[PDB]
Design a binder for this molecule. Sequence first.
Ligand SMILES: O=C(O)CN(CCN(CC(=O)O)CC(=O)O)CC(=O)O
Ligand SMILES: [Fe+3]
Length: 498
Amino acid sequence: APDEITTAWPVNVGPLNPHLYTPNQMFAQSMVYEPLVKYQADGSVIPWLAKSWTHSEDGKTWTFTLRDDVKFSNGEPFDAEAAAENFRAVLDNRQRHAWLELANQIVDVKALSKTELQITLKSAYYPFLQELALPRPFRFIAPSQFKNHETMNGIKAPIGTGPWILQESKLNQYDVFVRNENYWGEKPAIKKITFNVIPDPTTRAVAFETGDIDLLYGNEGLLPLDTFARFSQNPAYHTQLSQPIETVMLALNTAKAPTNELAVREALNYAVNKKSLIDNALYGTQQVADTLFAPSVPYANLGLKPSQYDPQKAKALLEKAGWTLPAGKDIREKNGQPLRIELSFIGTDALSKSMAEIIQADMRQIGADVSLIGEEESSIYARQRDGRFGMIFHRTWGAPYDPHAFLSSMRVPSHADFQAQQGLADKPLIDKEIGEVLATHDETQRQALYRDILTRLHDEAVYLPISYISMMVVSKPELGNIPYAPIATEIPFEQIKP
Ligand SMILES: O=C(O)CN(CCN(CC(=O)O)CC(=O)O)CC(=O)O
Ligand SMILES: [Fe+3]
């Protein structure tokens, strides 16, 4: 069947509530649900469910003109009432969306007619349109499928306007999607997509080698990277590696001994041989990261000075800070206290473990004792939210989140970044400036504020950037060239064209 494919995902796609997070998978929410405006790789948006829009001079009131020809997959019309009901349903759960500042800025949403939708904002929020473009939460389910006139407590059928329809889901086995034959836009070439639930990366590679699946698409965790490199040379297969999409880093706890000392954080940022780490654990497949955001990220080409691998310098910094080696020991001490740092990661994630072992080795060579704390996912996320870590693996979010949304979220205390930053004298100023940068319409001031925030974060050595990672593809050749989505968390199945 040349227009049916089988792929894999580590978990089910979830219930496909458009307005909720885990266990809903973003790429799948994006398959069914659509936005008012669609994000493009150049950073702009184009008309989508909204054909056009205007705003007020003060930038607080926006009026969208909607398409008039869009139906939900169940035949019900998409109109301004439906869109307004969705916004209400999202904002009824406002607390859950704190990380996204548009959810705090929207003050009112109302359908002025079937085709006119008015959105009012607290302030002149510059990332407005890009945040409407996101996979979640501002996309649209048929209001008939609300439960008790809400979505925050669940939905009935996951009815969107999008090019794919969920056919069926079987927990821990598979999810099947079919093409929407009444889609308002271009019809996908592919008719059916089956997602086999395959949690282990090795098991995913095996499934591809046996012919059980036709396509694997995902980030650096998709399959073992040595196997990837092998497949890349195998003439029976097709593989791809995108340009980098986001940063993988450690976050260092500025509020916990001994990472509360700037000098210790500086030393750590000279201690890791990142090129080696990438060649060893990532099989040469990713790029070295010197800064939180790659220089290609909007607002982030700042000429920030890299801390290159330099164990001599790391040891000098620590000696100067009073962290010195006792007679016959390899671990430094200050005030009888050992230089001991806990590194938390997801313990069943083989790649993270491999990286953690490398980081531990490199840091031992400069007299820091890194203890590896590998735990289940829920325990790691809990550590991130409450700052119970020394160092922790973390990542940025990709386009169109990076940098404005990721920075916005640094203000939210129940996220790793806030927690890592909590010990900085200038954290309140950073948070103030993050608030300002998002509202400011003076473009000169906006660049200054991004420079200031990112520069403080860099100079304070809050992070240990490791790698700018890429999306990876393995496919049967008959599927052809597999496109990448502008939005880093989306999978553009509708663009596959054998
Ligand atoms: O996952 C969440 O609950 C919310 N996200 C907000 C950022 N997300 C977008 C999302 O979940 O909608 C980025 C991402 O998950 O890549 C927090 C996080 O991932 O750290
Ligand atoms: Fe998220």
